[PDB]
């Protein structure tokens, strides 16, 4: 079996990865070694199946002995250790959740249900570095995989509804804490049937602007609001989050010609699920029934939700998707602009297909 | 002095209207009469230094004695009374917030900062029925009016982030109460520094799908989620909310040729503000500086927010816009599809320009 090291397994993304690996019994097929910085020397996690000890995440010798390394530690860790490992002559496999190495020429962005062909070709051509793609793009491709696989996409315009988990654990806690502040401030009024709605709203609105809401992580309030800007501002007017759409979509698919992908990435008051609205320009006029068939046939997670009111309300929402591996796509119909214009709405959990799942599956392929 | 009757003045939209009328001293030039659908006989609001009794909203003789009727009562009321009132020989002015008469041949959809010419022509041509437009369309036009007025729009695709107020007062209370349930369920964990984020989220997620949350008004949860379907299902696959986009935009502007308007209307966890993401196809390559100038020059409420990170976070959000008459537009840049593809993000209060304000302004013109 292969000797596999795990870095950042206690972080949020790493914890989801561990959860999934235990669910799939992935530790029975490998010889796992766990790393740490604040708990080195302590016993390895029992769920790992070994009686080992937590190794030093910065001990190069401990790392060099491994065949595979799966890290969810972050960019800073990768930027320090990855180069040192490669410079030492280490030719093992590096599976990373951080975005740092995504655009490197010797790295492949992984999402096997979509680009297994790219992964296989890379493995045969000496690629030893595999990086998960941005949550937004990975979820988009999991849901719309059938359209891209059949080369039916001319261009894609998107408007996202992104969850707090994308920001981080403390961001999620900030969102929930804010919900508590808003409700608590008008709890008495809500409990009073005769209270005036405009009195309730005024109080919530005023509190939101009061400066009393904790906003250290998002900068501004999120509960009851939204923020139409995610990540650093670029010279072309895009946010880095929006820039990743075209950059990563094309690298994941290894397109022969650039497929334009652009839009607005907005942070909303959701915990883990990213929802996305699309305006897709098709290369040709294909019927909706054919579109539904192609999307559903691509992979088992792209559940097609019939374009009917009640079922959409029940299945195409964060409430129905959080914590699941399903990446449903619905509201499929042609837009008024023409038969080559397709509308679509998707939902997907940011921590699974958008983070940990592609890593677990890549590791399984190498086991 | 015109005799003006008010219906549905006690409800949420009516209350916002009353508040605005008080702020602008709109009761001074008219003789106000207040009606009730179930409380006739009780004292009437002592607005504009007047006193009286609530009249019967269903008494045709009482209604016929008026010169102008301003109703925020709703479609069911309009559908029952309007035809009977007109058939009884009433030739007064009917100003309505309900969608009922919007597409009638003898009615004009009003948004004066955008279509005063249409309103003026209608008045001279005998039109006596004026109806406010859908909140989505009215807010879109208040923000993007400059692009339409200069006939630069080929087509527009939209993704909305609609507030609960569009559903109603009960809907808003349901959202806030749900926020209370979600936070309350994990309040102890949030207050514990060492608590694990995944344990917190697991509980919130489970509670959300438990069936314990109150959802009588929206059907499914809204706090921490969203619903990509608003109003009745139509045969073309659109929801009625989405259908109003093209129908009302073209009628408000009185276009010579149909401008395609389509997209997805999504309900989100906001109280009063609607936000909208746009993909606009221009008829020609217009520079962003020119676009900014045209938008700002159209009307005083179309605040152009510079496409910069920090200012966008502070001003292009529901938190910054709720309760104000400002209808800001930002994130203006060209999309990767080409120089004729324009991106824009708008925010606007649903109860003001999206409901009550157009009515107040129309009344002022008839006083
Ligand atoms: Na071996
Ligand atoms: Na840092
Ligand atoms: Na259908
Ligand atoms: Na007269
Ligand atoms: Na700029």
From Swiss-Prot, chains A, B:
Keyword terms, alphabetized: Amino-acid biosynthesis, Diaminopimelate biosynthesis, Lysine biosynthesis, Methionine biosynthesis, NADP, Oxidoreductase, Threonine biosynthesis
Enzyme class, spelled out: oxidoreductase
Origin: domain of life: Bacteria
Binding site for substrate: 162, 241, 267
GO MF term set: aspartate-semialdehyde dehydrogenase activity; NAD binding; NADP binding; protein dimerization activity
GO biological process: 'de novo' L-methionine biosynthetic process; diaminopimelate biosynthetic process; DNA damage response; homoserine biosynthetic process; isoleucine biosynthetic process; lysine biosynthetic process via diaminopimelate; threonine biosynthetic process
PROSITE patterns assigned: ASD (PS01103)
Residues with S-cysteinyl cysteine modification: 135
Residues of the active site: 135, 274
Activity regulation description: Is inhibited by L- and D-cystine, and by other cystine derivatives, via the formation of a covalently bound cysteine at the active site Cys-135.
Keyword match Iron: no
Catalytic activity: L-aspartate 4-semialdehyde + phosphate + NADP(+) = 4-phospho-L-aspartate + NADPH + H(+)
Record pathway: Amino-acid biosynthesis; L-lysine biosynthesis via DAP pathway; (S)-tetrahydrodipicolinate from L-aspartate: step 2/4; Amino-acid biosynthesis; L-methionine biosynthesis via de novo pathway; L-homoserine from L-aspartate: step 2/3; Amino-acid biosynthesis; L-threonine biosynthesis; L-threonine from L-aspartate: step 2/5
Any Pfam family the entry gives: Semialdhyde_dh
EC number: 1.2.1.11
Residues noted as binding NADP(+) in the record, renumbered to the chain: 10-13, 37-38, 73, 165-169, 173, 193, 350
Gene Ontology terms: cellular component: cytosol
Ligand binding (phosphate): 102, 244
Free-text note on domains in this protein's UniProt record: Consists of two domains, an N-terminal nucleotide-binding domain and a C-terminal dimerization domain.
HAMAP family xrefs: ASADH (MF_02121)
Complex formation: Homodimer.
Family: Belongs to the aspartate-semialdehyde dehydrogenase family.
Described function: Catalyzes the NADPH-dependent formation of L-aspartate-semialdehyde (L-ASA) by the reductive dephosphorylation of L-aspartyl-4-phosphate.
Name this polypeptide is given: Aspartate-semialdehyde dehydrogenase
